[PDB]
Write a protein that binds this DNA or RNA. Structure first.
Ligand code: NA
Length: 319
DNA sequence: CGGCAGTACTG
DNA sequence: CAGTAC
DNA sequence: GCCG
């Protein structure tokens, strides 16, 4: 359960991160998968041929693994553009991605203070910038509990039947959480409809929601802060789903993102697709001309079973 | 080589 | 539509 | 980046 390849994964991560901020999204993904594969390997990798037998690791990656193995270093790291750390700075701003980080850099911006004054910001980015440090800190698991509970108590005041579950890294049992995701549904047919808009206004007037980032029909991305002195602003999502979708949503929003991805790819090998909504039979084509059949999945286990896969609890889904 | 998810909001 | 994030 |  321990990473026997740490000195190697560290160097790789620096390189992946650089590709990521530069917007080389797919090469960065390739790196991420190789890195997870290395973290879970039963022992320190000791040969180029052993590295190649690992799924997610190919010639080029093995090459870099062995260089670090035998050198201690990765020459490539020495040739990353000086731009990278500023690109990373700017793209740590919620709502700012690689294109915006890049644009700002091309304009000569170099610090958050520059961005704050001299730069043009979307409404989302401004909320991101002003909560920049708060949003970078992981919060104690117990603060995730308070936040989730604040939502649940305000939710159940409208309909005591509503189920609220905190997902993401919280559900996966982490001691600290980067954000909170509160999934809400109702066991009955569908008493989840109608109360969303009212819950948010309640939480807002109450003082809990400080800023809105995205107001969707059934998904809310925003910012909360618990009552009291010295509280930090925390990133918060609320999703409302019909009961039929509870299992898939629970799975998706629990993630992790890497796990979700691997689950989609498996589903694909079995002629299926997996989304936050459903495990479904393949779609009708030409192109793309109709939905697949939805496969009933009351529980997460159902989803794993239908993919011919043993159930893995939330704590075992880092990837 | 192409796919690596599909969508949902904001502007 | 481009960009961003779930 | 990797994989079929
Ligand atoms: Na960001």
């Amino acid at each position: 359960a321990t990473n026997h390849n740490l000195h190697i994964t560290e160097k790789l991560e620096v390189l992946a991160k650089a590709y990521s901020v530069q917007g080389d999204k797919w090469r960065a993904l390739g790196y991420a998968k190789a890195i997870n594969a290395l973290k879970s390997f039963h022992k320190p990798v000791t040969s180029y041929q052993e590295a190649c037998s690992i799924p997610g690791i190919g010639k080029r990656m093995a090459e870099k693994i062995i260089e670090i193995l035998e050198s201690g270093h990765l020459r490539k790291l020495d040739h990353i553009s000086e731009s990278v750390p500023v690109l990373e700075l700017f793209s740590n701003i919620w709502g700012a991605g690689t294109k915006t980080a890049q644009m700002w850099y091309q304009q000569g911006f170099r610090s958050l203070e520059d961005i704050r004054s001299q730069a043009s910001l979307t409404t989302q980015q401004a909320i991101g910038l002003k909560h920049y440090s708060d949003f970078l800190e992981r919060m104690p698991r117990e603060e995730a509990t308070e936040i989730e509970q604040t939502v649940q108590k305000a939710a159940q005041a409208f309909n005591s039947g509503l189920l609220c579950v905190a997902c993401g890294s919280y559900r996966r049992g982490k001691a600290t959480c980067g954000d909170v995701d509160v999934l809400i549904t109702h066991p009955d047919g569908r008493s989840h409809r109608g109360i969303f808009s009212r819950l948010l206004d309640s939480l807002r007037q109450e003082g809990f929601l400080t800023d809105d980032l995205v107001k969707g029909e059934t998904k809310y991305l925003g910012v909360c802060r618990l009552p009291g002195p010295g509280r930090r602003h925390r990133r918060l999502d609320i999703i409302v789903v019909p009961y039929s979708e509870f299992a898939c949503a629970l799975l998706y929003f629990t993630g992790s993102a890497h796990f979700n991805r691997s689950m989609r790819a498996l589903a694909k090998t079995k002629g299926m697709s997996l989304s936050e909504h459903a495990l479904s039979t393949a779609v009708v084509r030409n192109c793309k001309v109709g939905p697949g059949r939805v496969l009933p999945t009351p529980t997460e286990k159902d989803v794993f079973r239908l993919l011919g896969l043993p159930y893995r609890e939330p704590a075992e889904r880092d990837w």
